[PDB]
Amino acid sequence: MKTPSQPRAIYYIVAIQIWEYFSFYGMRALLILYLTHQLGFDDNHAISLFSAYASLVYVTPILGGWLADRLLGNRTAVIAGALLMTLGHVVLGIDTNSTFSLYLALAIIICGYGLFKSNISCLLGELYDENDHRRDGGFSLLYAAGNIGSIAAPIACGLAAQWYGWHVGFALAGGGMFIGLLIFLSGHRHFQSTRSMDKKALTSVKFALPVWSWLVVMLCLAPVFFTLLLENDWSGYLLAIVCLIAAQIIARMMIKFPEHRRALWQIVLLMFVGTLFWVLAQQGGSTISLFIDRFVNRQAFNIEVPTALFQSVNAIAVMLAGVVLAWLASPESRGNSTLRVWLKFAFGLLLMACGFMLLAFDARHAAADGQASMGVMISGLALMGFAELFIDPVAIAQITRLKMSGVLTGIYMLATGAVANWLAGVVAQQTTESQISGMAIAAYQRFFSQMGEWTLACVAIIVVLAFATRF
């Protein structure tokens, strides 16, 4: 007999997954351009704020996962997260001229994203029995939904912003999130099997107060906390605490499972190298977006392409590459697995190097005309997108060889997200040592040349050690 179909609720989860990824990746395409053009931030300040936001959105999902586990259930937390992200995009759209509006909106979005990101996948995993064969198709479709939304959002938001200004771009992102929420809520009759909210826990009293009122207080104060954390650039102290906690978890883990201790060190070393990779990769939305805005010739068809659209190019490059390797998946995946892993990382770093070399070459030879060339930059972005398939999938495939691999996966994603984004913001300050003179193309040319050189240095070190340890 034919296999049973996917549980119909999947298609509503997919729908919200698209629209959330639409909103999140739309705002991300506009943000640094809005900070510079509308608000008149110096590049140092804009890059700092951007990287702080990009780290906190990788930090808060742990807290929202613990909240959905202990109190809310996954469905409630998904709904609340979508409401909060909608509210924050509406706040950002309604007033484009206060800066406090910006910080408040970003804090509200960070909270809603923290409630959403983990719990949407937990809710998808709740629909299947423990040995259901459909689960892999489910999660693959959810990943495809996220890729679709990541490709689609920078185009639509960029065009809407160009034609009507930043207000309508952010309003469009929020309307996307709201559409997705209404689609999800219309499917409620299919979710009746999923875990409801723990009414007994919420009606438990802790100190003088019922727990639900502590959630009300938290809903009020957490946006204030994150607003102050962003406005003062204090996110680094939180990131340091998170890193210290993760290090303690790993150390206790090293004691508890000494028969796997050396394997754990391999994962640690992977966490290091992948973090450095993502530092480079996170130049994509910050320094490279400013370079494209300022110094690339974007004229075509007697039209000018909005810089935000080039953020979609990366996503296309990732998705296409994902297909091709899937088209070419082959039984040669055997033998010295650790050496193969390290050579995959070396190849990804090499592709990242080539991307930065193409950007540096373009920014140098622009001097023949005065502006850089769209095709060489596009090629760099494409190569940088392709590089991403050889890092995180190989790392998670290596981690998932162990038990306890969910916590190590969480720690790996926390490092390569939050730490890599904060370090990317720190590194990007090297583009802006020449504040007094004004920005010039030579500063980006130096930055890209240095990034290429360091990438090839890391490639050489990895390859040399990996082969020297074979003999």
Residue numbers in the entry: 1 to 471
Text from the published report:
Proton-coupled Oligopeptide Transporters (POTs) of the Major Facilitator Superfamily (MFS) mediate the uptake of short di- and tripeptides in all phyla of life. The E. coli genome codes for four different POTs, known as Di- and tripeptide permeases A-D (DtpA-D). DtpA and B exhibit a prototypical substrate preference similar to the human PepT1 transporter, while DtpC and D have been classified as atypical POTs, because DtpC prefers dipeptides in particular those with a lysine residue in the second position. The DtpC structure revealed the expected and well-known MFS transporter fold, with twelve transmembrane helices (TMs) organized in two helical bundles and additional two TMs specific for the POT family (known as HA and HB domains).
DtpC in complex with the conformation specific nanobody 26 turned out to be more rigid and a significant fraction of the sample dimeric, allowing us to reconstruct DtpC to 2.7 Å resolution. Therefore, we performed a local refinement, focused on one copy of the membrane protein, which extended the resolution of the reconstruction to 2.7 Å and improved the accuracy of the atomic model for subsequent structural analysis. The peptide binding site of DtpC is exposed to the cytoplasmic side. In the case of the here described DtpC structure, the IF state is open. Tight closure of both bundles above the binding site is mediated by a salt bridge between D43 (TM2, N-bundle) and R294 (TM7, C-bundle) and hydrogen bonds between H37 (TM1, N-bundle) and D293 (TM7) as well as R28 (TM1) and N421 (TM11, C-bundle). In DtpC, the E1XXE2R motif, has evolved to Q1XXE2Y (where Q1 = N17, E2 = E20, Y=Y21). In DtpC, we now observe that the side chain pocket has a different architecture and characteristic in comparison with the one of canonical POTs. It displays an overall more acidic groove caused by the presence of the aspartate residue 392, conserved among atypical POTs. By replacing the phenyl group with a lysine side chain (generating the known DtpC dipeptide substrate Ala-Lys instead of Ala-Phe), we postulate a putative salt bridge between the carboxyl group of D392 and the ε-amino group of the lysine side chain. This observation, together with previous biochemical work allows us to hypothesize that the selectivity of DtpC for dipeptides with C-terminal lysine or arginine residues is caused by swapping a salt bridge between the recurrent carboxyl group of the peptide terminus and the transporter (R21Y mutation), to a side chain specific salt bridge with D392.
